[PDB]
């Protein structure tokens, strides 16, 4: 069955240094075998994983400043950077990897973060 890629709002988020910043990644899953990855961009259009839900069990002890919570409505997720630093500003997105009935990855539209002084 066809499904639509996830949505990632807000499209732009500005926060002064020290505060928490929170995005919402919404995904309308067709099965229960899927993961959501939270990427931060590099200038080469290259994907860099920050965190994922459900948690990646292979590489533990990861940065506890980047968290992904699953809201109990069945489609919404909170990607939050706690105590954002200046260099935490950049381009962010989320991406759904379904594992059934067909393994397929679809990325969300990108969003920006600006941590200020």
């Amino acid at each position: 069955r066809p499904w639509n890629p996830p949505t990632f709002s807000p499209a732009l988020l500005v926060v002064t240094e020290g505060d928490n910043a929170t995005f919402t990644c919404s995904f309308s899953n067709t099965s229960e075998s899927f993961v959501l990855n939270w990427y931060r961009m590099s200038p080469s259009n290259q994907t860099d994983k920050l965190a994922a839900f459900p948690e990646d069990r292979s590489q533990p002890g990861q940065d506890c400043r980047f968290r992904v919570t699953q809201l109990p409505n069945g489609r919404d997720f909170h990607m939050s950077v706690v105590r954002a630093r200046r260099n935490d500003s950049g381009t962010y997105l989320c991406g759904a990897i379904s594992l059934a009935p067909k393994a397929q990855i679809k990325e969300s539209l990108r969003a920006e973060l600006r941590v200020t002084e």
């Epitope: 075998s33 459900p54 069990r57 292979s58």
Partner: antibody, heavy 117, light 108 residues
């Protein structure tokens, strides 16, 4: 830290039943898929069943469909495989496993099930 | 049903020499392919996932490549501790299907 331990293997006569258990630890059990993969002695790997984290999606191949039933207990961090109407070609080591986006990343030790007169 | 065809089935390799195993899918599976090593008397162990990404803890001398229907596992310098059976597997569609196995033996 992910640990999977099988139980309930042994010898059974053709046509008999057998129930396999898989106790899990090291991760939030209810958020990940659980699977059974078997291997006949001296042969290759064959996927037997998969169950979603919530437990509402189960997947079987045609070779065991209608005989084997994969089930889980999320409150008890354990997985089960009910094997009815066993034939001689079901004789194999049964590994419980937990697949994610990285494939079948976690395997148990495997328990031997022998079907013979 | 998707058929993973491995080649070869036996691979005699001298220590230090590179080894490479080919796996060909009966239909397009994109890059949803994993490689496992199973040492005799042990459970399978994941080496490569998503056709090319190394699993946590896998030495850098293991690498994976390929897309569509053609995939390749490469061991740049074969150590003695790489002996075992190597499996390729697609997890794009159910049923998940493995290769028949590739037995890596040391040439001496």
């Amino acid at each position: 830290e992910v640990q999977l331990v099988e139980s309930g293997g042994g010898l059974v006569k053709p046509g008999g039943s057998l129930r396999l258990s898989c106790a899990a630890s090291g991760f939030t059990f209810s958020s990940y898929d659980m699977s059974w993969v078997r291997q006949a002695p001296g042969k290759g790997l064959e996927w037997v069943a998969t169950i979603s984290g919530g437990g509402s999606y189960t997947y079987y191949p045609d070779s065991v469909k209608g005989r084997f039933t994969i089930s889980r207990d999320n409150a008890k961090n354990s997985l089960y495989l009910q094997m009815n109407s066993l034939r001689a070609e079901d004789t194999a080591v049964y590994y419980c496993a937990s697949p994610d986006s990285s494939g079948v990343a976690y395997w148990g030790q495997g328990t031997l099930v022998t079907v013979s007169s | 049903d998707i058929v993973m065809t491995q080649s070869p089935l036996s691979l005699p390799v001298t220590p230090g020499e590179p080894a490479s195993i080919t796996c060909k899918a009966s239909q397009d599976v994109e890059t949803v392919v994993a490689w496992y090593l199973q040492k005799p008397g042990q459970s399978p162990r994941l080496l490569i996932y998503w056709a090319s990404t190394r699993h946590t803890g896998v030495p850098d001398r293991f690498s994976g490549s390929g897309s569509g229907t053609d995939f390749t596992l490469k061991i740049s310098r074969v150590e003695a501790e790489d002996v075992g059976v190597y499996y390729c597997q697609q997890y794009s569609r159910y049923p998940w299907t493995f290769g028949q196995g590739t037995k890596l033996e040391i040439k001496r």
